[PDB]
Design an enzyme around this catalytic site. Structure first.
Site, PDB file in Angstrom:
ATOM      1  N   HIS A  10      44.782  41.381  45.230  1.00  0.00           N
ATOM      2  CA  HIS A  10      44.226  40.406  46.108  1.00  0.00           C
ATOM      3  C   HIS A  10      44.179  39.004  45.295  1.00  0.00           C
ATOM      4  CE1 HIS A  10      40.182  41.875  44.559  1.00  0.00           C
ATOM      5  NE2 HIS A  10      40.254  40.724  43.853  1.00  0.00           N
TER       6      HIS A  10
ATOM      7  N   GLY B  42      35.165  36.405  40.225  1.00  0.00           N
ATOM      8  CA  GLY B  42      35.676  36.141  39.118  1.00  0.00           C
ATOM      9  C   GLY B  42      35.911  37.392  38.158  1.00  0.00           C
TER      10      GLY B  42
ATOM     11  N   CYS C 211      36.731  40.360  39.153  1.00  0.00           N
ATOM     12  CA  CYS C 211      37.683  41.401  39.320  1.00  0.00           C
ATOM     13  C   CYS C 211      38.925  41.561  38.580  1.00  0.00           C
ATOM     14  CB  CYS C 211      38.193  41.010  40.800  1.00  0.00           C
ATOM     15  SG  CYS C 211      37.224  41.690  42.206  1.00  0.00           S
TER      16      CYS C 211
HETATM   17  C1  LIG Z   1      35.680  40.667  41.968  1.00  0.00           C
HETATM   18  C2  LIG Z   1      36.128  39.195  42.379  1.00  0.00           C
HETATM   19  O1  LIG Z   1      36.506  38.490  41.367  1.00  0.00           O
HETATM   20  N1  LIG Z   1      36.019  38.762  43.489  1.00  0.00           N
HETATM   21  C3  LIG Z   1      36.872  37.513  44.159  1.00  0.00           C
HETATM   22  C4  LIG Z   1      37.912  37.778  45.116  1.00  0.00           C
HETATM   23  N2  LIG Z   1      37.369  38.680  46.169  1.00  0.00           N
HETATM   24  C5  LIG Z   1      38.692  38.989  47.137  1.00  0.00           C
HETATM   25  C6  LIG Z   1      38.299  40.246  48.142  1.00  0.00           C
HETATM   26  C7  LIG Z   1      38.563  41.445  48.053  1.00  0.00           C
HETATM   27  C8  LIG Z   1      38.181  42.318  49.228  1.00  0.00           C
HETATM   28  C9  LIG Z   1      37.604  41.246  50.247  1.00  0.00           C
HETATM   29  S1  LIG Z   1      37.316  39.718  49.590  1.00  0.00           S
HETATM   30  C10 LIG Z   1      36.814  39.897  45.722  1.00  0.00           C
HETATM   31  C11 LIG Z   1      35.587  39.711  44.839  1.00  0.00           C
END
Ligand SMILES: *CC(=O)N1CCN(Cc2cccs2)CC1
Ligand SMILES: *CC(=O)N1CCN(Cc2cccs2)CC1
Lengths: 304, 304
Positions: free
Chosen positions: B41, B143, B145
């Site tokens: 993603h 941020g 992820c």
């Molecule tokens: C964990 C993190 O950084 N984020 C930001 C990006 N976001 C994208 C998505 C994934 C599933 C639905 S939106 C996830 C959370």
């Protein structure tokens, strides 16, 4: 979202852990620059621990008696001195992994991370607080002494604790990195009882703010209180008295949530008087007091 | 003595964290050998997240579109591929700090440490468990992820989790390092509800053993039970059914304490039916289930 008991990343401190052996005793040492810091009780036999005269015991020790090993390589000891309850072993090699560091002496209520080590090797990392009775509730077996407590501000490690002792009640006592014990504890195998372990009120309020930020709001009520009224309840429940200094430190959390500090005090007052009624706050069935207002802001904002 | 929620030392994993930016999206990546692993993603805009067709979105991305930065130095991307829900970015430089590692897919009930990172920079480390509903209860902001979950066996890091999502209920979902999500979750901004978060019975029993080893014994009673009788109670209280496999894994803790596994089951049964009565076990007012039998043995023995 989510709120966890989080420790600082331990890598900077792992790079400093060494093993120190003196005679038949082995514990951990902290290698920073060309100095290895360790509890002075490394020179003791279990027999000496009963009533040790450290200056006398130290006279029988020379540089070559302190075996310092970093990983699988031996460090050469070129000097040794005692500062309060720590020994400073000067070695001929500066630790190449020495981070930016400071030695700080923390106040009760302050939190820190501990890198528990055995034989100079890291076993785990957990978060602690210096209790109001100057003990810490850690996880330390024989061989863990010399493990350190620290905080990190971006790239500077502030070392605040070194493990020295376990009281008969299972709680822990140690020193700052100048070798001065927190509280009245001494490095002797004698009767040492901890005082009242009171709850760190300002930390509980910070954690209640973290709960609201992270969705747990059931405990919010329609009441307010004053510092004096709240403190009557805090006295009854063995909580630290709340001061205007604590209210001021909670300012940023109050600003973020829109909940006045005294209104959060009133929620805490009802929680103390009524209990949780089988409910939980941030996955806990008791009021957590080992998160400072700064820890809550840090975790809720993602400071690295 | 003392028993704490302890994470593995994070240094080996800190040496692997990088920042990955694709367009205007920034998250973390895991750099092992000459490959950087990150959630797919990273190629999405918040608009794409509604119903993303990752193979189609990826066609618009070339190697130069993936900005990978390790500290303050840029890595050159010479290849990219998608494996399930992760991207593998081949870089021209092997990570010099690559530890011995494995990719493992854990079962529910298994615990691990998370090194929460933002912009490739570590913020903290905490202990988690893969819940029976395949979610984890972490602490992850935007941020975070690409932050990973891991276990260490002496010098080999077994990576088991990569953070991808937060459900509307504040719980977390992610993948193993092959990009397969734990549970039925998908990397899409859609209605995804977690199933019953049942309690990991074998972990609670392991933690009760740790409490006895560390002095908390008030909950020990004069009763015993059978697996079938215990499971009638476990069903009522949303606990995982206990199997003979779980009894076998508790063998070493039973041997150390002299408390038969079924007698500890009977103590747990009374604790479920009667509650804690305002008492605590290892500083907790609820039954802790994020310590496996292996974690208890490790912490109680000081494995490094
Ligand atoms: C964990 C993190 O950084 N984020 C930001 C990006 N976001 C994208 C998505 C994934 C599933 C639905 S939106 C996830 C959370
Ligand atoms: C923490 C640790 O390793 N130990 C072993 C050495 N032991 C010496 C003593 C200090 C005070 C009384 S005995 C302390 C615990």
């Amino acid at each position: 979202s989510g709120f966890r008991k989080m420790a600082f990343p331990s890598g900077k401190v792992e790079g400093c852990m060494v093993q120190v052996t003196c005679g038949t005793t082995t514990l951990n040492g902290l290698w920073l620059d060309d100095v290895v810091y360790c509890p002075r009780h490394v020179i003791c036999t279990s027999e000496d621990m009963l009533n040790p005269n450290y200056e006398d015991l130290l006279i029988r020790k020379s540089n070559h008696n302190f075996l310092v090993q970093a990983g699988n390589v031996q460090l050469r000891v070129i000097g040794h001195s005692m500062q309060n309850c720590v020994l400073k072993l000067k070695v001929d090699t500066a630790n190449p992994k020495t981070p930016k560091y400071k030695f700080v002496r923390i106040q009760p209520g302050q939190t820190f991370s501990v890198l528990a080590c055995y034989n100079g090797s890291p076993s785990g990392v957990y978060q602690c607080a210096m209790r109001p009775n100057f003990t810490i509730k850690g996880s330390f077996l024989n061989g863990s002494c010399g493990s350190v407590g620290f905080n990190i501000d971006y790239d500077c490690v502030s070392f605040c604790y070194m493990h020295h002792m376990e009281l008969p009640t299972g709680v822990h006592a140690g020193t700052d990195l100048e070798g001065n014990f927190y509280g009245p504890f001494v490095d002797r195998q004698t009767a040492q009882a901890a005082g009242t372990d009171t709850t760190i009120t300002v930390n509980v309020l910070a954690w209640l703010y973290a709960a609201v930020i992270n969705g747990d709001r059931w405990f919010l009520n329609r009441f307010t209180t004053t510092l004096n009224d709240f403190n009557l309840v805090a006295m009854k429940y063995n909580y630290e008295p709340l001061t205007q200094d604590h209210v001021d430190i909670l300012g940023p959390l109050s600003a973020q949530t829109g909940i006045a500090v005294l209104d959060m005090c009133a929620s805490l007052k009802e929680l103390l008087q009524n209990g949780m009624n089988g409910r939980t706050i941030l996955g806990s069935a008791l009021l957590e007091d080992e998160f400072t207002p700064f820890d809550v802001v840090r975790q809720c904002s993602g400071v690295t």
